[PDB]
């Protein structure tokens, strides 16, 4: 499978999530993503193929993972935005008030402005702190994809939101929406993962 930011992916045939970006670690590929959605060794799916399996996560208290894939995946430095790519340039971290766009298997690619940092999200497994918030709306299956700048700069990937009974937080007024997602550096030196970009 091409392994863009956005897309979804199954863990153990049963739940979903999206996919963060592309990173190798030396000379093995993965793509970080939301440790919520998965536990270590849990199997990774692409479109009905094995992909890879969870290398590491940190849920509750932080909420990030990488998966391990085979070497017949092909890592992209791309974020997906409908039937057009965003292309990652970097991890610059932006600051309150910097526009921010997210993409996901379930609300698509939305924009927004980050609001606050260093948010802790209260879910029902416990507290996950160090969030940045944003509110570009999201939806459930979201978590684990891409927040990235219009301009190719990485910011982290999908935690929570304040869900609605729709399922998402995209039919309340941006004013009222608390996204979060975790910050991309400190997993990626966590891992000592790099990022791939173009």
Known sequence: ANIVGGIEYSINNASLCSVGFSV????????????????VNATARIGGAVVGTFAARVFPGNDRAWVSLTSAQTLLPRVANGSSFVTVRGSTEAAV????CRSGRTT???????????????????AV??????????????????????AGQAQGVMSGLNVQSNGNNCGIPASQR???????QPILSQYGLSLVTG
Do not use: M, P
Not at 110 to 121: E, H, Y
């Open 108 to 126: 698509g690619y939305q924009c927004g402005t980050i609001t606050a940092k260093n948010v802790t999200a209260n879910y029902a497994e416990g």
């Open 97 to 100: 008030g910097a526009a921010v």
């Open 178 to 184: 608390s996204s979060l997602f975790e910050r991309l």
């Open 24 to 39: 190798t670690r030396g000379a093995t590929k993965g793509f970080v993503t939301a440790g919520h959605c998965g536990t």
């Open 129 to 150: 702190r160090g969030l940045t918030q944003g509110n570009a709306c999201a939806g459930r299956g979201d978590s684990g994809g891409s927040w990235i700048t219009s």
